Design a binder for this molecule. Structure first.
Ligand SMILES: Cc1cc2nc3c(=O)[nH]c(=O)nc-3n(C[C@H](O)[C@H](O)[C@H](O)COP(=O)(O)OP(=O)(O)OC[C@H]3O[C@@H](n4cnc5c(N)ncnc54)[C@H](O)[C@@H]3O)c2cc1C
Ligand SMILES: [Cl-]
Length: 385
């Protein structure tokens, strides 16, 4: 008996950003979440996320990253919660052997991004505590950095609610009923209707998009991070130790300097367990690889950051087959917007994605170029159910 203008299902990284954008414009919005964001059951916890701009994954990503960066600076000004610290982001790998490094370097050139290029011992000299072989090269982006991701969602929620958005917590959406002129969601706490729907359920998109007659390969992965006791004279943000994402022969790792003595945090990017979001084991350390894959990197490349484990977390990626996002209207329903498959690299864009989703919901179009995120693209291996 309350009709909304827009309902957002899944008020996490993408949905809460969309909620803020909609509320800002006086759009009557309901956000429904299975938990109470920010929380520790989805893809947004573990405190910190890298934002970088030299995005070799595709041209379309660079302006989205730069717009998102400006939106994060705006958010910083709007809230009391801490949003962004400009740690810089270091990318390294073996010379001539890392597509990730090469693509990052190409992206910086193509978009005239401000970066430093260094190699071998220059890396170890600039950032004491890093020990790479002489045949490694690097590209450092001084103006990118680290987002406090739980703070971001909390701030967007507070601002959205202040403007009149309603947030229904601890409420799982179980089904959808879509009409030419309205949308309906079904939950154990009641059913709700609106003119438009945004669907942004994170790892649960892989289970519930079938309720919208969609059959899209989406695989959730269990991805752990650990915080380690570190040499603070080397690895502290206070001594300019950078965020990093790097490629070594056995994969990609990412991490964060120690903030206020929390310890250096590390994740292994290219490996995780295939899981179901409803049965995933969210306890860190239950597989020996959780800790050992991290320490194998640290002892080789960041040896003074390989101390006692201070904290672990268990988070999820949701991968598409091509590892590009899905941001598009539902092919059968122009009043339904889908945001899915962020493939372990979506958080930095979540501010810009909130803007895109807002535009798609209200106008059926966006000013951003999102062509590479089309739900109809062949590399998805997608169709209707
Ligand atoms: C360990 C780790 C490190 C990462 N590091 C980075 C990084 O450094 N840089 C970067 O850009 N990205 C990073 N990412 C990726 C980024 O965090 C994700 O791409 C992004 O958070 C996905 O956002 P989302 O809104 O799709 O999912 P979420 O933020 O998980 O939001 C989905 C929401 O949907 C809700 N929901 C689920 N089912 C229902 C239902 N049936 N009804 C109602 N609500 C429902 C959930 O409760 C949740 O709140 C990392 C991810 C992980 C796991
Ligand atoms: Cl993801």
């Amino acid at each position: 008996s309350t009709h909304f203008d827009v309902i957002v299902v899944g008020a996490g990284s993408m949905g809460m950003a969309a909620g803020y954008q909609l509320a800002k414009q006086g759009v009557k919005t309901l956000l429904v979440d299975a938990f109470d964001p920010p929380h520790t059951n989805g893809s947004h916890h573990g405190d910190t996320r890298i934002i970088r701009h030299a995005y070799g994954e595709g041209r379309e990503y660079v302006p989205l990253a730069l717009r998102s960066q400006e939106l994060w600076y705006e958010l910083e000004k709007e809230t009391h919660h801490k949003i962004f610290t400009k740690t810089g982001v270091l990318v390294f790998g073996p010379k001539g052997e890392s597509a990730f490094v090469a693509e990052t370097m190409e992206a910086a050139k193509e978009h005239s991004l401000t970066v430093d290029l260094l190699e071998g011992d220059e890396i170890n000299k600039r950032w004491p505590g890093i020990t790479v072989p002489e045949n490694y090269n690097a590209i450092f982006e001084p103006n990118s950095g680290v987002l406090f991701s739980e703070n971001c969602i909390r701030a967007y929620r507070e601002l959205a609610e202040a403007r009149g958005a309603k947030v229904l917590t601890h409420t799982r959406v179980e089904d959808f009923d879509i009409s030419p002129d309205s949308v309906k969601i079904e939950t154990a706490n009641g059913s709700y209707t609106a003119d438009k729907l945004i669907v942004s359920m994170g790892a649960w998109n892989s289970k519930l998009l079938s309720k919208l007659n969609l059959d899209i390969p989406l695989q959730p992965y269990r991805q752990v991070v650990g915080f380690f006791e570190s040499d603070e004279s080397k690895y502290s943000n206070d001594i300019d130790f950078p965020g990093f994402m790097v490629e070594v022969p056995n994969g990609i790792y990412y991490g964060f300097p120690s903030f206020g003595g929390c310890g250096l945090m590390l994740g292994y990017h290219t490996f995780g367990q295939k899981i179901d979001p409803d049965t995933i084991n969210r306890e860190f350390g239950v597989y020996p690889e959780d800790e050992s894959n991290l320490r194998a990197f640290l002892e080789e490349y960041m040896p003074g950051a390989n101390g006692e484990l201070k904290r672990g977390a268990v988070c999820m990626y949701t991968k598409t087959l091509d590892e590009h996002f899905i941001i598009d209207l539902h092919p059968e329903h122009s009043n339904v917007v889908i945001a899915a498959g962020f493939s372990g690299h979506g958080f930095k864009f979540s501010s810009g994605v909130g803007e895109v989703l807002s535009q798609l919901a209200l106008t059926g179009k966006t000013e951003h170029d999102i062509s590479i995120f089309s739900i109809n693209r062949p590399a998805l291996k997608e169709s209707l159910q």
